[PDB]
Amino acid sequence: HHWGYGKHNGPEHWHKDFPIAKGERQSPVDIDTHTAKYDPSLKPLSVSYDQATSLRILNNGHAFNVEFDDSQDKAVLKGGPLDGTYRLIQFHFHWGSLDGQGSEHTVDKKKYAAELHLVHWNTKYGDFGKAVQQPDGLAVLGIFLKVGSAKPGLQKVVDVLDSIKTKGKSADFTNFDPRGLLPESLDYWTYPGSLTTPPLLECVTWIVLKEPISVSSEQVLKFRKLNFNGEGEPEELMVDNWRPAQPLKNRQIKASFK
Ligand SMILES: CCCCCCCCCCOS(N)(=O)=O
Numbered sequence: 001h002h003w004g005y006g007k008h009n010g011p012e013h014w015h016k017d018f019p020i021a022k023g024e025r026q027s028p029v030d031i032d033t034h035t036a037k038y039d040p041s042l043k044p045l046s047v048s049y050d051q052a053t054s055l056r057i058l059n060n061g062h063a064f065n066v067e068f069d070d071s072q073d074k075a076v077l078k079g080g081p082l083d084g085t086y087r088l089i090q091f092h093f094h095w096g097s098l099d100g101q102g103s104e105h106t107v108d109k110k111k112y113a114a115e116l117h118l119v120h121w122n123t124k125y126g127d128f129g130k131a132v133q134q135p136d137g138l139a140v141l142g143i144f145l146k147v148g149s150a151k152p153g154l155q156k157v158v159d160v161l162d163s164i165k166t167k168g169k170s171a172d173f174t175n176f177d178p179r180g181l182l183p184e185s186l187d188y189w190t191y192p193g194s195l196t197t198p199p200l201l202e203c204v205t206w207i208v209l210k211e212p213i214s215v216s217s218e219q220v221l222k223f224r225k226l227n228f229n230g231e232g233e234p235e236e237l238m239v240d241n242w243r244p245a246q247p248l249k250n251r252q253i254k255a256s257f258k
């Protein structure tokens with residue numbers, strides 16, 4: 001009985017195996033734009049993905065991960081609310097069964113069609129494993145997806161999904177440039193949170209971009225053709241793999257823009 005997004009193993013069940021699910025800094029959260037406050041102490045955000053080197057794409061039964069070689073100082077996120085440098089290790093998405101839902105974070109309760117998560121770990125901790133044992137071990141750059149014009153830079157990801165339809169399948173995925181998934185503006189909201197999937201560790205500094213990227217209906221429809229199940233098992237489409245907004249508790253969301 002592994003965790004998932006179904007009626008008997010979904011978000012409302014996670015707290016039993018992962019008590020931190022009801023913690024003090026859980027993610028995602030609803031971003032109340034009027035309550036968010038501009039923070040002058042925030043330094044310029046720096047996203048340097050020029051030397052990013054992807055290696056493989058994997059269907060882990062919950063979503064698909066585009067993995068990067070993080071053995072060297074490449075693809076780093078710094079500045080903004082961050083102290084030090086964070087290295088990109090992988091990115092993945094959360095999406096819905098319909099265009100009207102899919103994102104984890106919401107903006108004034110608005111749900112986007114999907115949400116992209118670029119996961120980075122604080123280099124001061126040596127590697128990802130040690131970083132997830134620290135309150136400032138991770139930084140996730142979240143980007144909303146809305147349905148409209150196609151995102152050219154996402155097509156290579158879309159076209160490889162047919163080869164990793166089921167849980168456990170992976171495929172070579174080199175030379176993918178994540179810069180092609182970024183919106184024009186880097187305006188963002190930030191707050192201290194957690195991983196949105198078990199183990200739900202509270203080690204994340206969330207940086208959620210205000211400007212969504214547009215993807216075509218055809219592109220997201222292909223995301224929805226993936227399977228939660230493994231090969232040879234009854235088909236359960238990989239859709240609605242998002243955790244709903246959690247209590248904000250003793251936290252404040254800061255804006256990088258006035
Ligand atoms: C402690 C070992 C488990 C670490 C698992 C990390 C999964 C990270 C990806 C899922 O998180 S999210 N949605 O970006 O917040």
Ligand SMILES: [Cl-]
Nearest residue numbers: 005006007236
């Ligand atoms: Cl189901």
Ligand SMILES: [Zn+2]
Nearest residue numbers: 092094117196
């Ligand atoms: Zn995620």
